[model samples]
Target: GAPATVTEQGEDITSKKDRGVLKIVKRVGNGEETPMIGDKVYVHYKGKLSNGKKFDSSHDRNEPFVFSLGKGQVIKAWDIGVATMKKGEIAHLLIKPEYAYGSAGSLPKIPSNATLFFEIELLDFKGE
Candidate 1:
């Protein structure tokens, strides 16, 4: 059988050198309003493995992640994919191990060389 050819629901816009991919889910957002480097980004996210088992949830902890965009504050996928999103966009990020945890995964939570999927909701972002 072929490696699970990604389905429509798991849509994709691949990255440089085919590193990771971004999927549009809800498609709600100001399409013209995108984030720039050094901008503080606020988003809620749920992290899952390939089997659809969740590894982490910012909502479960009753908090959203706040980080400076495109500054290596988050994973390579987040910086790469989320930088293209609008203020209200909700999307899924399909990331390879090389773009995620690499061969040495984040122990006890994410497995070694495990592919990661993240559901991200961009709530709001602004900075001076």
Candidate 2:
């Protein structure tokens, strides 16, 4: 399937990488702008499997994770989901297996074809 469509908050009802692969609900308002390609985005995230078991968290390290957008540095859902956010925004995301580790799930942590949940805070972004 092609990548997901771009959507705004309150736009109809909200994926491939568009809206199906990733579902988002914003808890905090967005910043002035979204991140562009090559921009370094800073975010604090909590990742958990569907069974309500945590997989990883930035809170544990008390440090935010920074990654470049639109570069596949992270999972497809993450690259797509974060692009829809702005600094200061907080959103919850449901990442489908296809957009995550897929059938080859990250062993010992995430099970096979496990759907994942993430709480992401768009802390900030840096321009190239």
How many residue pairs collide in each prediction?
0, 5
For model 2, residues 1-128, the per-residue Cα lDDT tens digits are 11122123322212422344444555665656888878999989877875677567998898889899979999877877787887788777776678888899988888888877777898888897
Q: Of the candidates shown, which would achieve the greatest lDDT relative to the real structure? A: 1
Report lDDT (Cα) of residue 39, candidate 2.
Answer: 91
TM-score of each: 0.83, 0.79
User: lDDT tens string, model 1, 1-128?
Assistant: 01133333444555455645646565578758788888898999877887665578898889888999888877777888888889989877777887788899887878888887777899888973
Candidates' RMSD to native:
3.4, 5.9
Candidate 1: stretches off by over 4 Å: 1-15
List candidate 2 segments past 4 Å from native: 1-19
Candidate 2 has a TM-score of 0.79
